Amino acid sequence: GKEEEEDSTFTNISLADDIGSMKFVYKEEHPFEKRRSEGEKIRKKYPDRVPVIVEKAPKARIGDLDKKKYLVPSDLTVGQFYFLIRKRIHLRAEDALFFFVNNVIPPTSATMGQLYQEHHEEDFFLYIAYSDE
C-alpha cells in the first residue's frame, strides 16, 4: 500500500549496505598462523564444539557484542544461536536479526556444526556477521 511506501525522507544507500563488503576485524588484528594454531587445537580438544567469531555487519544500528570469540556445541541450531546472540545484544524480540556466513544467510535447519563443516576458514574458525533488517 501507499502508506507502506516512503517518499518524504531520503534513504541513504551505499556499499555499507552490501554484506559482501564486511571485513572482520579479528582477521586483521590476529595473524593467520596464531588463529590457525588456536582453532586447530580447540577442534582437536573439543570435537563436539565449533569455534566461531561473531561481528556486527557494517550498516547495522543494533547493539554490540561484548565478546566476539565463542565455542558453540555442534548440535546447536541456527535458530538457537540467533536467540542466544539476540539476548547478548539486548535486541527486543519484535525486531529482526540476520546472520551471514560467506555472504549467505544460513539454511533454516542448519546446526552450527553443519555450518562449520561447510563454511569454516583455513584458520579453523567460522565467521558470522549479524545485522538488522
Residue numbers in the entry: -20 to 112
Study authors write:
On top of these canonical LIR interactions additional specific contacts were observed between the SCOC core LIR motif as well as the adjacent N- and C-terminal regions and GABARAP. Within the core LIR motif, N16SCOC in position X2 was hydrogen bonded with the guanidinium of R28GAB. In the C-terminal region, hydrophobic interactions were observed between L19SCOC in position X5 and the edge of HP2 (L55/L63GAB). In line with the GST pull down experiments, biolayer-interferometry (BLI) affinity measurements showed that the SCOC LIR binds strongest to GABARAP (3.6 µM) and GABARAPL1 (2.3 µM), followed by LC3C (8.7 µM) and LC3A (27.8 µM), and weakest to GABARAPL2 (44.4 µM), and LC3B (270 µM).
Autophagy-related 8 (ATG8) proteins play a central role in autophagosome formation and selective delivery of cytoplasmic cargo to lysosomes by recruiting autophagy adaptors and receptors. The LC3-interacting region (LIR) docking site (LDS) of ATG8 proteins binds to LIR motifs present in autophagy adaptors and receptors.
